[PDB]
Amino acid sequence: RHKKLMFK
Amino acid sequence: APHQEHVLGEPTLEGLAHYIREKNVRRILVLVGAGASVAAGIPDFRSPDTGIYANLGKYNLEDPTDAFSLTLLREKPEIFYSIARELNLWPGHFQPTAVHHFIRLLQDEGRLLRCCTQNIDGLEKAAGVSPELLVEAHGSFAAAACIECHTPFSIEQNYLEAMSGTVSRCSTCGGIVKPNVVFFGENLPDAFFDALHHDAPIAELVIIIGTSMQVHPFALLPCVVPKSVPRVVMNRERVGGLLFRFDVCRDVLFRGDCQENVVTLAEYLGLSEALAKRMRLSD
Ligand SMILES: [Zn+2]
């Protein structure tokens, strides 16, 4: 489980 | 080339419907993103003649997606609240599309394993996809809560405050309240992890409509289904990089309007009357 993210 | 023989036989909407019927496919995982709801009239962040885009300008963001950042919300809540006022995502404004009604039909046919949506528009729910079968992986505007202590807040109060220019505040800690949209940096709901660990590994078919693959962990869903099951992508863009090959040949990309493609799929599935009937009944 990890939090909502995006690679920027 | 033999190594290109497709798991679907013919990698077409016709072949897909045949495959579903001939193999009696009952465990269909449907994933849904922003492309599915364009036809409902949802304002695209990225479109220059929208009201939503005009707003974002003054603030100057290295991405419309920073409006959904938890750290920007704590710092300058006026920014997300200003976007919330313009998107009109409160339930009961937008109506479900042909894609949304289709998923409801899959459920009523006993073929839906789970519907997992990254949209925050509540349209799957508006189309009658049941609670046990629907995962709103990024929440929606249906309920609200404090971001500091997680205490629920009246959505009706939050709506009235937001739409009149007021940032809502927790009556326990003075924290900032927002609708229960999952922001960048927040936890996804449990039901997302249920779907990832328990549904996707047993899918017989995955149909991925209008999604990006660039928001995580949501984008893992189609990566964890069995290596042999068909993965159908309906999108206006060639998405997924090298994770998709449009190990057996099992991926297909259907370009064009996902609303039209679902209607065609429905025809071949023998569901065209049920779909036209849902579509009239609420447009
Ligand atoms: Zn609080």
Numbering used by the authors:
A (entry chain C): 379 to 386
B (entry chain A): 7 to 252, 324 to 360
Reproduce text from the manuscript describing this model:
Deleting 51 residues from a proteolytically-sensitive region connecting the β8 and β9 strands of the catalytic core led to the crystallization and structural resolution of Leishmania infantum SIR2rp1. Crystals suitable for X-ray diffraction could be obtained only with LiSIR2rp1(ΔP253-E303) mutant, uniquely in the presence of the p53 peptide substrate. Crystals belonged to the P21 space group and contained two LiSIR2rp1(ΔP253-E303) /p53 complexes per asymmetric unit. In addition to a small number of residues missing at both N- and C- terminal ends of the protein (N-ter M1-R6 and C-ter A371-T373 are missing in both monomers), region R52-P70 could not be modeled in monomer B. Moreover, additionally to region P253-E303 removed from the recombinant protein, electron density was missing for residues A304 to P323 in both monomers, suggesting potential flexibility of this region. The two protein monomers of the asymmetric unit are highly similar (rmsd of 0.4Å for all Cα atoms) with a typical sirtuin two-domain structure —a large Rossman-fold domain (pink) and a smaller zinc-binding domain (turquoise). The zinc-binding domain comprises a two-stranded antiparallel β-sheet with four α-helices and includes a Zn2+ ion coordinated by four strictly conserved cysteines (Cys152, 155, 176 and 179). The p53 peptide backbone forms an anti-parallel β-sheet like interaction termed the β-staple, with main chain residues 191 and 192 of the small domain and residue 222 of the large domain. The acetylated side chain of lysine 382 inserts into a hydrophobic tunnel delineated by Val 188 and Val 221. Deeper, the Nζ of the acetylated lysine forms a hydrogen bond with the carbonyl group of Val 188 main chain, and the acetyl group is trapped between Phe 74, His 144, Phe 189 and Phe 190. With similarity to that observed with human and yeast SIR2 homologues, structural comparisons of LiSIR2rp1(ΔP253-E303) complexed with p53 peptide with apo ScHst2, shows a rigid rotation of the Leishmania small zinc-binding domain towards the large domain (≈10°), closing the LiSIR2rp1 binding site.
